[PDB]
Design a protein around this ligand. Structure first.
Ligand SMILES: N=C(N)c1ccc2cc([C@@H]3O[C@H]3c3ccccc3)ccc2c1
Length: 246
């Protein structure tokens, strides 16, 4: 997250921190994710497509720092790694950038809801917030595009939703951004998601309910003028989410 504020997991309790174990035992941060039901974390396929072995992944819930075992946190392995069958990557745009991770503790259990571990509501079909609505994003991604390290403390920011017609403008993304994608950014281009924030939530308060409207997917650079963050439009994928979580 470029700009924004440092926060803690009690403010983002649906946030999942996803890591990968390498041969030799080293563990590194991969991407963010969101808890949609006790057994299911939703994220982005581009985070896993090059290493599609479910055994390689570690998922944390209730974790506030990158290298701290936060009080109340829960650690899980991935029982099922479900990647969207028609995923593809263009120079910038990712297509069907959505993945499901069925999680399980070493005891074979799903998440135990608490003050720091909570699910996030899914949207209803054809019901997204209007353009201009403020939504929040969270993650452990880069604070600056030139950084190679990620921040130790979890960060959040607030961005505004941008219409499909505005995002398809020539100085924005043209026809590279589709109707299955949602754009959001800072009108002053000072705050945004960045590399490392992929798979994490775009949460919008809609008709009084906090909703998982988007999943961090792609963007040209980070907090670059006329280059919004692009998010998987969760409402389009409700039949795919319901069928793959059954
Ligand atoms: N401007 C943004 N909001 C934004 C949002 C998500 C991003 C995600 C990346 C990921 O590093 C890119 C990548 C591409 C292809 C495969 C894996 C990772 C880089 C820049 C990103 C920028």
């Amino acid at each position: 997250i470029i700009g924004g504020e440092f926060t803690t997991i009690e403010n983002q309790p649906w946030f999942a921190a996803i890591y990968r174990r390498h041969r030799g035992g080293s563990v590194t941060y991969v991407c963010g994710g969101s808890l949609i039901s006790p057994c299911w974390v939703i994220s982005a396929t581009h985070c896993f497509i090059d290493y599609p072995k479910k055994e390689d992944y570690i998922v944390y819930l209730g974790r506030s720092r990158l290298n701290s075992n936060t009080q109340g946190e829960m650690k899980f392995e991935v029982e099922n790694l479900i990647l969207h069958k028609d995923y593809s990557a263009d120079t910038l745009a990712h297509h069907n950038d959505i993945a499901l991770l069925k999680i399980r503790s070493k005891e074979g259990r799903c998440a135990q809801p608490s003050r720091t571990i909570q699910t996030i509501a899914l949207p209803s079909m054809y019901n997204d917030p209007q353009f201009g609505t403020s939504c929040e994003i969270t993650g452990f991604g880069k604070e600056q595009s030139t950084d190679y390290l990620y921040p130790e403390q979890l960060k959040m920011t607030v961005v505004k939703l941008i219409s499909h017609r505005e995002c398809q403008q020539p100085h924005y993304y043209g026809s590279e951004v589709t109707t299955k994608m949602l754009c959001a950014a800072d009108p002053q281009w000072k705050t945004d998601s960045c590399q490392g924030d992929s798979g994490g939530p775009l949460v919008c308060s809609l008709q009084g309910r906090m909703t998982l409207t988007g999943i961090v997917s792609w963007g040209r650079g980070c907090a670059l003028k006329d280059k919004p963050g692009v998010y998987t439009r969760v409402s389009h994928f409700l039949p795919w989410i319901r069928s793959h979580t059954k």
